[PDB]
Amino acid sequence: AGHMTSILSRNHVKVKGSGKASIMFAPGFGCDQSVWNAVAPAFEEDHRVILFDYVGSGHSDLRAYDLNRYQTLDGYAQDVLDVCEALDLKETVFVGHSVGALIGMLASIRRPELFSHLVMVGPSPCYLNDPPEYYGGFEEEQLLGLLEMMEKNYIGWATVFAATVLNQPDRPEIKEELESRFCSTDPVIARQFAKAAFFSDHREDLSKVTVPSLILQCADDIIAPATVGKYMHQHLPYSSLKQMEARGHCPHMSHPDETIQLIGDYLKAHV
Q: What residues form the catalytic site here?
């Protein structure tokens, strides 16, 4: 019933700025569009900026949620496609953080003509260790452990996982923020999201990406170690790799200035 508006509502879609091209920003796990507050507004000057939420975010009607659709990342890739269709876009730059980068990647394989560039901030095609070929950074039991803790002691998991992704003990404020964001997210949906994200394996899909991609690798990132970014650079047909000085897995919130710089340099070079 009035689908364009229903999509715009379900995904809290907003457009800002103005320009010939547009940049869609996609949050990482447990985050809403506001995590982009320190980065995204720097691009409104020259581009229409698109922000949106995945279903399941605290202030979410949740009456838009569907058990089956979001069981796998495809359901998430479908939301991105839905937003692009509602906004009636012909093409757009896509900036995604963490699992958001992969969600964007999946949608690009389904509809490549819809994406000009894929800017990935801290991506991983698989979090599982697979020596000798691949080192995702986690043993199945480690991920299975966090999943279990998510069910038994959610609040506890929120603070433990927040500490882990940031990997910056001398930066408590960003730490408490991520923690709050995790506590504010529907736990049932969050667990479905975590499972779908941390157990997926997209290594075989890298070769299918035909859209140009920029991989921003973080330093001392526990979630997405340097080896995963290097591996992605190697297997993605059209890509470039950039080692950030930024530490942890969330540079867009802990080091917004460098994040803005690298993304700006890239778009400036491919315009």
A: 98, 221, 249
